[PDB]
Paper text:
Importantly, aberrant FGF/FGFR signaling has been linked to several developmental syndromes and a broad range of human malignancies. A number of crystal structures of FGFR KD in non-phosphorylated and phosphorylated forms have been reported.
The two monomers are highly similar, exhibiting rmsd values of 0.39 Å over 280 Å and 0.09 Å over 39 Å within 6 Å of the JNJ42756493 binding site. The quinoxaline core of JNJ42756493 is observed to form a single hydrogen bond to the hinge region via the main chain amide of A564 while the dimethoxyphenyl ring is orientated perpendicular to the quinoxaline core and occupies the hydrophobic pocket located behind the gatekeeper residue (V561). A structural comparison of various drug compounds (JNJ42756493, BGJ-398, AZD4547, TKI258 and AP24534) bound to FGFR1 KD clearly indicates that a unique feature of JNJ42756493 is the amide side chain which extends into the region of the binding site normally occupied by the a-phosphate of ATP where it forms a hydrogen bond to the side chain of D641.
Residue numbers in the entry: 464 to 580, 592 to 765
The structure:
Amino acid sequence: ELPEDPRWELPRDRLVLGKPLGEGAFGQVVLAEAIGLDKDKPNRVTKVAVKMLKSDATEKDLSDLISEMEMMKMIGKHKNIINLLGACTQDGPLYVIVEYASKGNLREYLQARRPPGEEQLSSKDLVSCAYQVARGMEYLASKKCIHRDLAARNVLVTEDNVMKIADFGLARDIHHIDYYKKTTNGRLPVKWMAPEALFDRIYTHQSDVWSFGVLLWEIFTLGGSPYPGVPVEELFKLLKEGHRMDKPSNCTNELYMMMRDCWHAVPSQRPTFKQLVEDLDRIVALTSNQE
Ligand SMILES: COc1cc(OC)cc(N(CCNC(C)C)c2ccc3ncc(-c4cnn(C)c4)nc3c2)c1
């Protein structure tokens, strides 16, 4: 069965399962309340998210969920990632307990804050979003983690507006990706892939920087859809031609230069996440919150 790990084990009777938050093919996430998740106070409840298998899950799906939990244990904690908090592994179904991000994914967060046809985001708020995501990615890269699907849909937002990278440990067989498979919202994930990842199946920290450039474009378009109406075969042609997305409106030349630099054709020439954090820290400090 599953091996005991006292560093992370939470007794099942401490976890009160709640409403669904999200679902995949053979995995599901629910909101829950953990009683005494911390050794002191044992009388406090914490809202958490719990990932578990679907009822039609196979041995391979269980292996995949364990692999993701094990990677999260190894990577350790950071403010700008969804952190592992505990697990229920004994005498019942596997529950992987992680931080809850009440405001949901970044794509929906941005779209809900567009001016009418919560409150509007300032230019400083948008650059701060980009900075926090770059900080989470710099941490993951420092821990030898390659995300492989960095996009606003995979960034969650907490109640205190903290950006947290999600699904960085997700089991993924890159030789069995269906390029035609659309996301829940009807978009194609290939549109965030670096050309070397898409054409040659080569995933690196450099290919995650390319994806971060697409994510910057999503931020400054307030959750815009990259290449709307472009099918897989036409996207391949655009990438082969060296096509680059246009500058969004209300985006500085400097932040557009940053997107373009993330999209360098030569992977070695793209900025690193360390470089992006430093530049975004400087830009945040110089960006007005007055509009
Ligand atoms: C490392 O990141 C992980 C690890 C993990 O288990 C090991 C599960 C999650 N998930 C699934 C994440 N999938 C998507 C595709 C990004 C969470 C985690 C915390 C969550 N908090 C809030 C909400 C929420 C709020 N509003 N709405 C509509 C949904 N959804 C959550 C989903 C994230």
